[PDB]
Design a protein around this nucleic acid. Structure first.
Ligand SMILES: [Mg+2]
Ligand SMILES: [Mg+2]
Ligand SMILES: [Mg+2]
Ligand SMILES: [Mg+2]
Ligand SMILES: [Mg+2]
Lengths: 98, 79, 114, 151, 127, 96
RNA sequence: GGCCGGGAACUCAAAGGAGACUGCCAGUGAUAAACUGGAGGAAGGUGGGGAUGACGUCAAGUCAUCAUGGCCCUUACGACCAGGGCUACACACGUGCUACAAUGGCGCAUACAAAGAGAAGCGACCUCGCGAGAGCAAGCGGACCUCAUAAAGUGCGUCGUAGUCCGGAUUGGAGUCUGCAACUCGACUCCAUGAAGUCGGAAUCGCUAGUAAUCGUGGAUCAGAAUGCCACGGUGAAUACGU
């Protein structure tokens, strides 16, 4: 209904993006259960550090993908206004699906 | 063993086999493809298989249908 | 108990006895006993003379002993006469399936010599 | 182990009987880090020991172990180009440690069926001494007394 | 009111409850002997309940997930000691000596580059 | 990294949509246990460089045919040069 | 059957904090630094582990990843394409896997993981085949769905010291899968065959605690070939008197 799932890579970026959506909704409206933390997927890669030879020496890499879920339980015609296009997107992906 | 259903062969070499039956066999044909397999229609026809230098005269025989053309041309020379 | 082939085992299981003969092993040994209706755990001791011929008939269907020895050898001898890659690979004493002859070919090639 | 002296960490005791001595014994017998299959052999050996000998449970293996305790051992010097063996009094912590090792090593050389049986046969011939562990315990002792010179 | 205690042992989370009733052991809707605990780690669940006046003292419901045999067993060991909050901070002072309240900080080591598993450096040719 | 091999690669990739992909529907559903005729297997006289799993998948910057990760689409040497200059988002020194 | 209201405690999950600083106490020490011991505490003396590799050395490696001085070829050392080789074989060495077995083999039954990966993809459930797999074919861009039925271990039975139900090499016959294509030169399965080896000379390698060792799973690479590598967990020691 208002099931919105986010994605962000940074250790603290979405925490401020998922803050502003809460107090915007619950002020004029009601309910709004809040941000679910969700399990972080971590894609761990390993590549050779030297351009030639050197099997023992390598560099390890990781990309942490942090998810969040909004969950607004109240679909009012007032709270749907001032929700869309006040997000001010800082590269945070947003999706509207069940 | 391999190739599942149907014996896979090359198109261009099938025309050379049909040339040897219809127009008749004359000399050993110089073929670069080792991918095709021997059939009953290829029995009693002279063929030649390339293997890194020049085409070796491989004579076809009744019981060679079970194996490929590539087996009869050794690539690596020894001694 | 002669039991078809010349090999005569005794004081062991029926599953062990059938594996000892040429051209028959652990998989077929279950199928021969299951066909006749015989248990795996029963020994050769305490077994009737009429009960022997049922197992003797089933093992006699598939080619075994010296007939299968030459069946594989004739297919090798035929394959060597074809003048193929695998044919020259048999007679010279090297691996036929395409293993590394550089090192660890000691089974098919044979012991090290000067 | 140059500067840093150890804390000598304590293992947990044997859960059935409550003997801390048998907790070290099961660890020597253990191979591939399998404590479950290790104790199954040890308990099977101990039940056959007390039944055959007709003695009590806890003191059957204890008196058997007491006979295979080494009196003294030697240490390799290598100081002035020549190898010297100097005899030294083994400590009570090391005494049973080497004893439990030489029981398993002696049982390993046998040609018997099960590990429970062959180890129990080694425990059976510990009180009256014909075995391999009792031959193994007296090795440095023959070299000792001669090496009493160096002290 | 119920009496709670968590505990865990090598990524094996457990949840212990204690009530005043009968001495039956319920674990994941199964008995203690029917939880296969015959060999080593048979009575490590009742290790913190060794030195107490028991007879038939308490109900218990325990549920553990993660790890293997001894990982789940040692989680119940540390889990019951936290669940002694019925008896509160009186009986823990004697339990300090045993060291069952101590949560074990030993965890499995990460695999390292150029090593076979965490420590073992693979061998090399002569000198 | 030998720009002719990259020119050979750009050719190889550019034939994937034309000869196969669309007209590679032949041999998938058609060559199966149905109802045989061998004339469908005689359609393999096509140029062959269009093949769906032919490409080595070279690095897009340099053209090294080694250490190519599908995620980044770059070779191991260009991963370290890129990663230490940022550019890949949420990427840093992995330690746990 | 958490399966369905519902309850939100808790496990799990991850944003922000507290906590461990020789600080509280005792002793020793130039009264200072510090050390030993004890209390409290989940964690005590850099808590465990990782990232973090000084100035420089070996004119160490990489002109073959790229960049680039100079030199050289330039109707060729360039370019395109077929096939071949990179997988050869009287030999020598290193690095691994699987073993030589009753702490084990084989068969039936049964319990407990974590870390992952997935749309040109991972593939339920169902039917067919002894099997590898094939056809039909939901769900999920992913705490849902899929790979995934983890194995050691444990419960009974068989085997009772043999070149064996130990070990799997090698070879033959007959199959599946990926792809224009498996002969040189594959993975995997089916039947059959069952080399050597029964603890390995001198010598040599690693490791001080969830470590050695042992048993499994996953990923990157990749259409399709791991016993390598990387990542994860299960069981789990011995011995450290000393320099
Ligand atoms: Mg260039
Ligand atoms: Mg390729
Ligand atoms: Mg630092
Ligand atoms: Mg240099
Ligand atoms: Mg075998």
């Amino acid at each position: 209904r208002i099931r919105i799932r986010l994605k962000a890579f940074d250790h603290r970026l979405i925490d401020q993006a998922t803050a502003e959506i809460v107090e915007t909704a619950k002020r004029t409206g009601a309910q709004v259960r809040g941000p679910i933390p969700l399990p972080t997927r971590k894609e761990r890669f390993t590549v050779l550090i030297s351009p030639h030879v050197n099997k023992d020496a390598r560099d390890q890499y990781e990309i942490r993908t942090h998810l969040r879920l909004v969950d607004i339980v109240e679909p009012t015609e007032k709270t749907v206004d001032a929700l869309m296009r006040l997000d001010l997107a800082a590269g945070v992906d947003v999706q509207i699906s069940l | 063993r391999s190739l599942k259903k149907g014996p896979f062969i090359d198109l261009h070499l099938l025309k050379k086999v049909e040339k040897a039956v219809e127009s008749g066999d004359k000399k050993p044909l110089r073929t670069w493809s080792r991918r095709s397999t021997i059939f009953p229609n290829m029995i009693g026809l002279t063929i030649a298989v390339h293997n890194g230098r020049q085409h070796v005269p491989v004579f076809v025989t009744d019981e060679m249908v079970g194996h490929k053309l590539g087996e009869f041309a050794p690539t690596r020379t020894y001694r | 108990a002669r039991i078809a082939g010349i090999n005569i085992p005794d004081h062991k299981h029926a599953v062990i006895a059938l594996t000892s003969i040429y051209g028959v092993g652990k998989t077929r040994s279950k199928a021969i006993l299951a066909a006749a209706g015989i248990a795996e755990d029963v020994k050769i001791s305490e077994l009737s003379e009429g009960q022997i011929d049922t197992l003797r008939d089933e093992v006699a269907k598939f080619v075994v002993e010296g007939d299968l020895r030459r069946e594989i050898s004739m297919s090798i001898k035929r394959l060597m006469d074809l003048g193929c890659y695998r044919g020259l690979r048999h007679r010279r004493g090297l691996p036929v399936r395409g293993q590394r002859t550089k090192t660890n070919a000691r089974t098919r090639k044979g012991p090290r010599k000067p | 182990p140059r500067r840093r002296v150890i804390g000598q960490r304590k293992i947990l005791p044997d859960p059935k009987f409550g003997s801390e001595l048998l907790a070290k014994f099961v660890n020597i017998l253990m191979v591939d880090g399998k404590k479950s299959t290790a104790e199954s052999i040890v308990y099977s050996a101990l039940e056959t020991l007390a039944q055959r000998s007709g003695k009590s449970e806890l003191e059957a293996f204890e008196v058997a172990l007491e006979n295979v305790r080494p009196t003294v051992e030697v240490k390799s010097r290598r100081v002035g180009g020549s190898t010297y063996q100097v005899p030294v009094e083994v400590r009570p912590v090391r005494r049973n440690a080497l004893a439990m090792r030489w029981i398993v090593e002696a049982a390993r050389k046998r040609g018997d069926k099960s590990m429970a049986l062959r180890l129990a046969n080694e425990l059976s011939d510990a009180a009256e001494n014909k075995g391999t562990a009792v031959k193994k315990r007296e090795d440095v002792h023959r070299m000792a007394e001669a090496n009493k010179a160096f002290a | 009111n119920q009496y709670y205690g968590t505990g865990r042992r090598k990524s094996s989370a457990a949840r212990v409850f204690i009530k005043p009733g009968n001495g039956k052991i319920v674990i994941n809707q199964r008995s203690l002997e029917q939880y296969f605990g015959r060999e080593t780690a048979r009575m490590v669940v009742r290790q913190p309940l060794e030195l107490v006046d028991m007879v038939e003292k308490l109900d218990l419901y325990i549920t553990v997930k993660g790890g293997g045999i001894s990982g789940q067993a040692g989680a119940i060991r540390h889990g019951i000691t936290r669940a002694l909050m019925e008896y509160d901070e009186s009986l823990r002072s004697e339990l300090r000596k045993a060291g069952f309240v101590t949560r074990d900080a030993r965890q499995v080591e990460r695999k390292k580059v150029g090593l076979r598993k965490a420590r073992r450096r693979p061998q090399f040719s002569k000198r | 990294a030998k720009q002719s091999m990259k020119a050979r690669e750009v050719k190889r990739v550019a034939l994937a949509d034309k000869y196969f992909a669309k007209r590679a529907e032949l041999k998938a559903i058609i060559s199966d246990v149905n109802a045989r005729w061998n004339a469908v297997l005689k359609l393999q006289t096509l140029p062959r460089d269009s093949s769906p799993s032919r490409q080595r998948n070279r690095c897009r910057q340099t053209g090294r045919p080694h250490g190519f990760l599908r995620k980044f689409g770059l070779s191991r040497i260009k991963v370290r040069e890129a990663a230490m200059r940022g550019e890949i988002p949420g990427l840093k020194k992995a330690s746990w």
